[PDB]
Paper text:
NA is a homotetrameric transmembrane glycoprotein responsible for cleavage of sialic acid from the host cell membrane. By blocking NA enzymatic activity, [name] inhibitors (NAIs) prevent new viral particles from being released from the surface of an infected cell, thus stopping the spread of virus in the airways. In this study, we applied a set of experimental techniques using recombinant NA variants to understand the molecular basis of development of oseltamivir resistance in the viral N1 [name] NA2009. To decipher the structural mechanism of resistance, we determined crystal structures of NA2009 mutants in complex with oseltamivir carboxylate.
Three variants ([name], [name]/I223V, and [name]/[name] NA2009) crystallized in the monoclinic space group with four molecules in the asymmetric unit, representing the tetrameric biological unit. In enzyme variants containing [name] in combination with the I223V or [name] mutation, an oseltamivir pose similar to that found in [name] was observed. The RMSD for superposition of oseltamivir atoms in the [name], [name]/I223V, and [name]/[name] NA2009 variant was below 0.11 Å. In the [name]/[name] variant, the water-mediated contact with the oxygen atom between the N247 side-chain and pentyloxy substituent of oseltamivir seen in [name] NA2009 does not form due to the change in position of the pentyloxy substituent caused by the [name] substitution. The dramatic effect of the [name]/[name] double mutation on susceptibility to oseltamivir (8-fold and 500-fold increase in Ki compared to the [name] and [name] single mutants, respectively) can thus be attributed to the combined influence of the change in oseltamivir pose and alterations in the hydration shell structure. Most of the mutated NAs retained Km values almost identical to that of wild-type, while the [name]/[name] double mutation resulted in a three-fold decrease in substrate-binding ability. Ki values for the I223V/[name] and [name]/[name] double mutants were 3900- and 9000-fold higher than the wt NA2009 value, respectively. The catalytic efficiencies of the [name], I223V/[name], and [name]/ [name] variants were 4–6% of the wt value, illustrating the significant effect of the [name] mutation on the enzyme’s catalytic activity.
Residue numbers in the entry:
A (entry chain C), B (entry chain B), C (entry chain A), D (entry chain D): 82 to 468
The structure:
Amino acid sequence: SVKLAGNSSLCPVSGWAIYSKDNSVRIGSKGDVFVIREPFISCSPLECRTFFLTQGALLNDKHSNGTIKDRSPYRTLMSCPIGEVPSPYNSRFESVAWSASACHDGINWLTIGISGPDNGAVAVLKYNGIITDTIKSWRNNILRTQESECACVNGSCFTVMTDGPNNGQASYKIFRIEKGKIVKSVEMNAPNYYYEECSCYPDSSEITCVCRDNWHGSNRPWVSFNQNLEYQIGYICSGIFGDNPRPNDKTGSCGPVSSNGANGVKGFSFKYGNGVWIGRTKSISSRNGFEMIWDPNGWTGTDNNFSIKQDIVGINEWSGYSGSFVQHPELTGLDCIRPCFWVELIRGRPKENTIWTSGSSISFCGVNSDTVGWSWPDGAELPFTID
Amino acid sequence: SVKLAGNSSLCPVSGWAIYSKDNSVRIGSKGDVFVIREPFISCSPLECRTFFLTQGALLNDKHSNGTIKDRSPYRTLMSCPIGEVPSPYNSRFESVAWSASACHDGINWLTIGISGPDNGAVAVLKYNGIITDTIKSWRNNILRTQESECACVNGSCFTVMTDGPNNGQASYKIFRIEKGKIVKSVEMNAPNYYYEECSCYPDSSEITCVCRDNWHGSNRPWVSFNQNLEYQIGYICSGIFGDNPRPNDKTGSCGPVSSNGANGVKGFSFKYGNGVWIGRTKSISSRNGFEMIWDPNGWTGTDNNFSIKQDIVGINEWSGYSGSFVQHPELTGLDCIRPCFWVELIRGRPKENTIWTSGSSISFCGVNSDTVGWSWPDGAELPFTID
Amino acid sequence: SVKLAGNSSLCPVSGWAIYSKDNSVRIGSKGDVFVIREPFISCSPLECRTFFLTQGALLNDKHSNGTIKDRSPYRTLMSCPIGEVPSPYNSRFESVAWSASACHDGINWLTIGISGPDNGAVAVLKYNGIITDTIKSWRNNILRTQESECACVNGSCFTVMTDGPNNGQASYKIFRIEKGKIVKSVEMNAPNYYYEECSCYPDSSEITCVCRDNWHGSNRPWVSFNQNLEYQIGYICSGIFGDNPRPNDKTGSCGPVSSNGANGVKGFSFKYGNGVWIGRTKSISSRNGFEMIWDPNGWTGTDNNFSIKQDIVGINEWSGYSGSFVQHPELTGLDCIRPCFWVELIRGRPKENTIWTSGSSISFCGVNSDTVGWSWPDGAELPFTID
Amino acid sequence: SVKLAGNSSLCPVSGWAIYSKDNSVRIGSKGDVFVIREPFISCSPLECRTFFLTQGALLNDKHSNGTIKDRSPYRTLMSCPIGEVPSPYNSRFESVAWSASACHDGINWLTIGISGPDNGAVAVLKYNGIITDTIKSWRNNILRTQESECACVNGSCFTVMTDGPNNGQASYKIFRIEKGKIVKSVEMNAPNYYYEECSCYPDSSEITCVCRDNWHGSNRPWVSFNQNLEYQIGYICSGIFGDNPRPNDKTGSCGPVSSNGANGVKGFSFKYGNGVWIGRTKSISSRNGFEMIWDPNGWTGTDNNFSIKQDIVGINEWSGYSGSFVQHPELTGLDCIRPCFWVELIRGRPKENTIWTSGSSISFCGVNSDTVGWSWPDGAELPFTID
Ligand SMILES: *[C@@H]1O[C@H](CO[C@@H]2O[C@@H](C)[C@@H](O)[C@@H](O)[C@@H]2O)[C@@H](O[C@@H]2O[C@H](CO)[C@@H](O[C@@H]3O[C@H](CO)[C@@H](O)[C@H](O)[C@@H]3O)[C@H](O)[C@H]2NC(C)=O)[C@H](O)[C@H]1NC(C)=O
Ligand SMILES: *[C@@H]1O[C@H](CO)[C@@H](O[C@@H]2O[C@H](CO)[C@@H](O)[C@H](O)[C@H]2NC(C)=O)[C@H](O)[C@H]1NC(C)=O
Ligand SMILES: CCC(CC)O[C@@H]1C=C(C(=O)O)C[C@H](N)[C@H]1NC(C)=O
Ligand SMILES: CCC(CC)O[C@@H]1C=C(C(=O)O)C[C@H](N)[C@H]1NC(C)=O
Ligand SMILES: CCC(CC)O[C@@H]1C=C(C(=O)O)C[C@H](N)[C@H]1NC(C)=O
Ligand SMILES: CCC(CC)O[C@@H]1C=C(C(=O)O)C[C@H](N)[C@H]1NC(C)=O
Ligand SMILES: *[C@@H]1O[C@H](CO)[C@@H](O)[C@H](O)[C@H]1NC(C)=O
Ligand SMILES: *[C@@H]1O[C@H](CO)[C@@H](O)[C@H](O)[C@H]1NC(C)=O
Ligand SMILES: *[C@@H]1O[C@H](CO)[C@@H](O)[C@H](O)[C@H]1NC(C)=O
Ligand SMILES: *[C@@H]1O[C@H](CO)[C@@H](O)[C@H](O)[C@H]1NC(C)=O
Ligand SMILES: *[C@@H]1O[C@H](CO)[C@@H](O)[C@H](O)[C@H]1NC(C)=O
Ligand SMILES: *[C@@H]1O[C@H](CO)[C@@H](O)[C@H](O)[C@H]1NC(C)=O
Ligand SMILES: *[C@@H]1O[C@H](CO)[C@@H](O)[C@H](O)[C@H]1NC(C)=O
Ligand SMILES: *[C@@H]1O[C@H](CO)[C@@H](O)[C@H](O)[C@H]1NC(C)=O
Ligand SMILES: [Ca+2]
Ligand SMILES: [Ca+2]
Ligand SMILES: [Ca+2]
Ligand SMILES: [Ca+2]
Ligand SMILES: [Ca+2]
Ligand SMILES: [Ca+2]
Ligand SMILES: [Ca+2]
Ligand SMILES: [Ca+2]
C-alpha cells in the first residue's frame, strides 16, 4: 500500500470511451434499488466505486414520496462498485449525509458527510470508516460540499466547501486533509464570485476545481491551488457556456456571465493549457442532453469557436449533474493521470408526474483511440406503479 | 492478529458525531429486511458490525405478526456491517437466540445466544462460530444477558447475565471468558439491587457496566470489576435520572430511586471520574426522543445540575434501547478507548397500530471537535401494507 | 492448507446445544428463497456450510408447483453459509443434482451430484468445482447417494451409493475418493439388508455409516469400514427403533425389524462402544417431532431401555430428514472429532394443502456442558399466497 | 499469478458430463433476475464465470418489453459465478455492450464491449476493468464480435470481429491483444466466406475458431491462426450440418453449403485431427433441442456418417446459442486443455407469446468416463404475469 503521487500531468485525450452504465431506475421498477441523487465515481489504486446520496428509501415504494427534497435526516452516503445498481444488498455504508465527498489517498478512503440542521450543519470526516475529524458550518447557511470526488496528491487530499446564501455572495473554503484530519484551511477572497459543487482533480501536484456559480454566472468559476492552499481564481472564458441554465453561445467572459446566470447545475471541465474540455447539457434551459466539447483556446479565450463535439446524451433525454473523476498511474500503469467523467440522469420530479426523484448514471474515460458520439439515456418508463 | 490490550483510558469527549443510520424500517417497506429488535454494535480491529435479534420473519410479510412477543424458537442472533439494513442477503448467521451478547477479543468474535424455554434457557457461547461452552439457567426464570457488546481486556471477555423475576430481587452473575470458554463466574451479592441488559465497556484494564433496574429504580445501577471479577456496586447519583420511565429531574440517590422505578429500558452511561455522560429518552414516560447529557459530578453527586445537553432524537419521535460500544486503539490508532453509542428506534407495537414490532438504528461516536444536536428519527410511515 | 487427519475418536457428549436455524420457509413467504429439500451440513477446516437440492424455483412463485416430485433436470446442488436462508443471492452453485453428497478433505471441497434419467443416472464428482470423475448407474434403477456429508480421513473421502429397487433387495457400493477421483469401490455382500441415504462419519481412522432400510426394517442398518473398504455390517439392535415409520418401542433385533419396516426416512446415529445416540422422529407413523436418545447398550443390546432423552422438535410439529455432520480437530482445536446433527423440517406436500414441498433446517453440536430440550420448529403458516 | 501457457493439446474426450445449470428464467418469475441473452462461460486459473448481455431490465418487469431488440444503449456486459442466476445482487459490471467477448490470460480479465450506433460502433477493451484500447467500426455496419470467450496463449489473447452486411460478403478481422492493448490485427482475405459469432479455443499454442455463416452456409466456417495471425480458412466438411437452419443430413462440402444457408445460430465445434465433435440443434429449422456428435472424419470428410450422438436438450424444447469454453491445465492440473461448452436456452419472442426475450443456460465438460444423454431444458412456464 502506497500514497498516490499525483505529480504527473493529465493525459491528453481526443475523445471519450464509455466506461459504465447502471440502469438503476429501469432495474428499480422491480428490484430493490435505492432512491438516490448526487452520485459520483472515485477510484482507489485497485477499483472504482460509485458513491451516492440515498433517500433512505427504495424505488417504487411509498417512502420514495417527497424525495424532491434535498436535505433530511434519512439521507446517507453509500457506495457500490461501478456500474452496479445501488441496492441495500450490494452497497457499503459510508456516512450520514445530505452533501458529500470522498477520495482515496492510496492507503484508505476519505469520506466527508454533512448532516444536521440547515443553520449549523456538520461535516463528519472518516478515514477507513473511522471518524477522524469534524467541521461545523461557519455561516449557518447550509454547509455544502462537492458532491464529487475530492483530490489527492502525495498523501494529502483536498476539497472545497461553501457556506452562506445560494442566491448571492457566499463563503468558500479550501481544505487540506491528511489521514482524514483537516491540517489546513483557507477562506477564499472571491468577491463577486460564487463557488459550489466543485469538481476537483489533481494535475502535476496541484489541484484544479471547476464549479457552479448559482448566483450570477452561466459560465463556470474555477479555482486552482497548490499543497499550501495558495490559490488562483477565474471563470472559464469560452463563449461555449458550461452552466445550465445559460444563454446561447456567444462571446464569453473571464468574469461571471450574468445572462441566464442565476441557478445552475453541478458540472466539470478539464484544463489543458489554454484549452478546455467542456462537459455540458445540450439544452440551454433544462437538464437535458449531454455533450463533450474540446475548445482549444476556451480556458483563456472568449470566442464561441470549438474544435470537437462528442454527443453523450441526446437533447430530448434527461440528464443532470456531471463530475470529474481520475484514474491515477498507480491504478492504470499509465504515465499520466487519466481524466474520466460521470453524468447523473435525473428522473421524476419536478419534470415528470411522479411522487419521487432519483437518478441513474453513466460514465466515460478519456482516450486517444477511436470513439463515437451517441445517446446512452436513462431508459426508464415513467410513471411507476407507486405513482 | 493480536489481542486488544484494553489498558488505556476512555477518550474524554465534548460531543457526539453521527456515525451510522440504517433506515431499516423505511427500506423494509419494500425490501427484504428482517423484523428485528435488540440491535447493538460491536467492533473488531478491522470493522464495526451491527448485531440484532431477528424474529425469523421479514417486514411487511405475514410472519411479522405478533412480533411484540419477546421469546420464540425462531429468534436468531445475526450481524451485518454497520449502517446496512439487516437482510437475509447481507446478514451473517451467529446463533439461535432470544437474548444475546457479542464482542471481539482482537483475534475472533465471541457470541452469546440464549434460547430454549423460560424455565431452563441455555446460553450457547461461540468463538469464531464454533461452540466453545454453554451456561444454563440457575434460577429457572428467563436467563437473559446484555443485548449489547461484551467487553474485552487482554484476551479475556466479560459479560453479565441475570436470572429470576423481573419485578423483584433476581440473581446477577459476572463471567470471564477466554476463547469462548467460561474461565470464571461469580454471583453478585447485591441485595435490594437489580441489574439486567448491562452496557459494559473496558477502561484502564477494568470493566464498567451500567444497567437497567426493572424492579424499583429510575436511576441506573452500575457494577465495575477487574479481571478477577472482584467487583464494586452502586447506582448513578445524578438527579438527571437515566431510566425510562422515571420522574422529572430532582435530587437523585446513590441507591435505587423508587419513584417511577418499576419497568425501564436498556441504556448506558460513561464514567469520567466523578462526572458522567448520560444517554436517555427525552420523555419521562415512554420511549420517545433521545439526548446526551454531560453531568460533571453526576456519577457521585445527587443534584440535577448539568453542563452539556446534545439532542439526538426529537421528543415526539420514537425511541427505544440504547447501548455503549467502543473503538479500541488497535482499530483507531488513538491512544485511548473511544466511546460510541447506538440507539434503537422502535416501531410498531405497543405504541402504533401494526401487527408487528421492529427497529431501525442510529449511532454516534464521541469526539472533541464540533458537533450539533438534531433529530435522526426512524422515518417510516406506519401502518404498512401488511397491517 | 493440510489434510484432515481423521484419526482421533468421536468426542463423548452428554447432550446437544443448538447451533443453527435458518427459518427458510418463514423468510421465503416474502423474500427470494429456493424451494429445497435434502439439506445437509458439512464443514471445511475454516467454515460450515449448508448444502441442499434446489427445485430450480423460489418459494411463493408458480414454478414451485409440483415440487413433491423428487427428480427433474431442474434440481441443482447448491450451498450457502450455515443458518442463512438458501437464496439465489447468497448461494454458491455446486452441481446439477437430484441426489448428492459433499465433504471437505482439508484441502478442497468434494461434491457429488447425480442427474440424468432414472434408468442410467450419472454421478458427477467435482474437486474444487472442477469435474474430476463420473460414475454411472450399474443397475439402471435410480442411482442414489447419501444426501448428507461424505467422510474424510487422511486425504481420502468415503461415500455410499445404492442402485436398484427401493421396495426390495438392491445393490450397495462403498467408494474411496482422492482429489475427486474414485480410487477404489466395492459392492457389499448384504443379502436381506437394505442401505440408502447413509449418514457417514469418521471415528479413529474408520468410517461408520447409519442408513435407511426402505425395504423391511424399522431399525437402522449400519456399515463400517477401513480405508481399504474392508467392511462390517449390522443393524442397530436397540428396541428404541430409529426409522420412520416404525412400531412402538419393544424388544429390538440385530437384523432388520420387519414390523412397519417398509418405507423410511433418512436418519443418523452415533456409536460409542456398545452405546448409541439415536436421533429420531417422535411420531411412529409420520415425519413429526424429533428427539435425541442415549441408550448405553443400544448398539448391541435389544432392550427398549435408555438413559437420556432430549427433545428437539415437539410431536405436533413437522420434521423430516436428519443427518450427521462432524467438526474435526483442525476446525475446533479439540482433541476429538465432534459429532453434530441437522434436521430438515419439511413443509407442504404431501401433508399440507399447498402446491409445493420445501424444508427449513435446524442443527445442534454435541457438548458436555449443560443443555436443554425444547422445540425449534419450522414456524411457517401455510398455506402461502401461491397456494 | 502466471500467464496461461496454452501450449498443450485439447484433451480427447468420449462424452460430456453436466457442469452447470442456472434455471434463470424459472427463478426470474419471482426473483430479481436480469433479462439477458448471449451468455457465455469463461474461466480464469481460479474460477469459471458466466458472462452475459443484459437488457438493462429485470424479468417480469415492464422494462423487459421489446427485448427481442438486439442493440440498445441499455445493454451491458456483466458476469457472475457459473451456475448462479444473473441478478443485480450477484453480478459484476463489465462494460456497456450489445456484443462482447471476454477471457483471462492467467493474470487478469480482458473484456470487449461494443456499443454505440449501428453505423459507427466502438469496441471498448478493458484489462482488469481499466480501459486499455478501443477499436471502431471500419465498414459502418454493426461491428460485432464473438459472444463467447476469446482465447489466450502465453500472455496474448485473440478474437475475431466482423463488420458489414449480415446477408452478404462482409469483412472479418483477427486480433492479437496483450494486456488489453491491440498489438496486431489482420483483415481476412475470405471471398465467398462469411464469419461471425466465432467460438475460438487454444490448442497447442494455436487458435481454432468455428463460426456462423449467416450469408449462404449451413455448415460452419472455421479459421485457425498462430500468434502472428497467419491464418488458414475452410468450412467443416461433414454432412452432419451444424448450423440452424440447415437441410437434412447428406453429403457435405468443404466450402459453404448453400442449401438453407441464409441465417444461422451461434455455435461451436472441436477439431481432433480429421474428426470433429459437433454441437447443434436437433431441429433443422428452429432453435429446438441440442445434441453432441462425434464424427471421426467430419472435419475433412463430406459423408454424413458419425459414430457417437449424446442428447443434451430434447427436440421439443427451446435451445439457442451455444459456444465453446476451455479449462486450462493451470486451473485443472491436467496435462491438456479441457473442452467444455454451454448452451443458451432462449425463451420468449419470437417463438412464444411474450413481450420479452431472455435466456437461461446449461454447460457440460468433456470427459472420458461414463456419461449419459438426457434433456436439461429451460423449464419455465410461459407466459409470465407481465405478459
Ligand atoms: C405524498 O406525500 C404528500 C405529502 O404528505 C406529507 O409527507 C408525507 C411523507 C407524510 O408524512 C404525510 O403524513 C404528510 O402529510 C401526501 O399528501 C398528504 O396526504 C395526507 C393524507 O393522505 C394529507 O393529510 C391531510 O392533512 C390536512 C391538514 O393539512 C387535514 O385537514 C386532512 O384531514 C388530512 O389529514 C396531507 O395534507 C397531504 N399533504 C400535502 C402537503 O398535501 C401525498 O398523499 C403522498 N402521496 C402518496 C402517493 O403517498
Ligand atoms: C409494451 O410496449 C408497447 C409499445 O410501446 C406498449 O404499447 C403502447 O402503450 C402506450 C402507453 O399507453 C400507448 O400510448 C401506445 O398506444 C401503445 N402502442 C402499441 C403499439 O401498443 C405496451 O403497453 C407495452 N407493454 C408493457 C407491459 O409495458
Ligand atoms: C443548498 C443550495 C444548493 C444550490 C441551489 O442546493 C442544491 C441543488 C440541487 C440541484 O440543483 O439539483 C440539489 C442539491 N442536492 C442541493 N444541495 C443541497 C446541499 O441541498
Ligand atoms: C425478561 C424480562 C425483561 C425485562 C422486563 O424483558 C425484556 C424487555 C424488553 C423491553 O422492555 O423492551 C425487551 C427484551 N427483549 C426483553 N428480554 C427478554 C429476554 O425477553
Ligand atoms: C429413489 C428412492 C428413494 C427412497 C424411497 O426416494 C427418496 C425418498 C424421499 C423421501 O422419502 O422423502 C426423498 C428423496 N429425494 C428420494 N430420493 C430420490 C433420489 O429421489
Ligand atoms: C447483426 C447481425 C447479426 C446476425 C443476423 O445479429 C445477431 C443475431 C442474433 C440471433 O440470430 O439470435 C442475436 C445477436 N445478438 C445479433 N447480434 C447483434 C450485434 O445484434
Ligand atoms: C513523481 O513522483 C514519483 C514518486 O515519488 C517520483 O519517482 C518521480 O520522480 C516524480 N515525477 C515524475 C514527473 O515522474
Ligand atoms: C510527500 O510527503 C512526504 C511526507 O510528508 C515528504 O517527505 C515528501 O517530500 C513529499 N514529496 C514532495 C515531492 O513534496
Ligand atoms: C498498555 O498495554 C500495553 C500492552 O502491550 C503496554 O505495552 C503499555 O505499557 C500499556 N499502555 C498504557 C497506555 O498504559
Ligand atoms: C396474529 O397474532 C395473534 C396474536 O397477536 C395470533 O394469536 C393470531 O392467531 C395471529 N394471526 C395469524 C394469521 O397468524
Ligand atoms: C495479559 O495476558 C497474558 C497471557 O495471559 C499475560 O502474560 C500478561 O501478563 C497479561 N498482561 C497484563 C497487563 O495483565
Ligand atoms: C399446478 O400444476 C398442476 C399440474 O400440472 C396444474 O394442473 C395446476 O393448475 C397447477 N396449479 C397452480 C396453482 O399453478
Ligand atoms: C496418510 O496418507 C499418506 C499417503 O498419502 C501415507 O504415506 C501416510 O502414511 C498416511 N497415514 C496413515 C496413518 O495412513
Ligand atoms: C512467451 O512469451 C514470452 C514473452 O514474450 C517469451 O519469452 C517466450 O519465448 C514465449 N513463449 C513461446 C513458447 O513462444
Ligand atoms: Ca449559474
Ligand atoms: Ca475557442
Ligand atoms: Ca426502572
Ligand atoms: Ca450535577
Ligand atoms: Ca424402514
Ligand atoms: Ca438399552
Ligand atoms: Ca447459415
Ligand atoms: Ca463422417
